[PDB]
């Protein structure tokens, strides 16, 4: 059980690293710092769409 | 004769007025191009993909 816990703990540390290090040109995504951002897909002002990923 | 000299003069003056309008409007032609360009950058900046540095 302890031997399995070693793998589980190592994989748990992996999930944390995945969230912390995943980035899009330096902009972190999965660590929760992205919050909500609006992507502008219109030919005039105020036609954006909000993306949120916790 | 006085009217004829005045009218021959008058088309010269109206040519000067046309020329000033042409010079002014040609200047605004590049102004319109500039404003359209800054609208491209303004629309691009509103995208959520951009970080602070962009």
From Swiss-Prot, chain A:
Coiled coil start-end: 1-21
Cell compartment(s), UniProt: Secreted; Bacterial flagellum
Biological function: Flagellin is the subunit protein which polymerizes to form the filaments of bacterial flagella. FlaB is not essential for flagellar synthesis and motility.
Quaternary context: Heteromer of multiple flagellin subunits including FlaA, FlaB, FlaC, FlaD and FlaE.
The family this protein is said to belong to: Belongs to the bacterial flagellin family.
Note: V.cholerae is able to differentially regulate the flagellins within the flagellum maybe to produce flagella which are particularly suited for motility within a given environment.
Protein name: Flagellin B
Species in which this protein is naturally found: Vibrio cholerae serotype O1 (strain ATCC 39315 / El Tor Inaba N16961)
Coverage span on the entire protein: 109 to 162 of 376
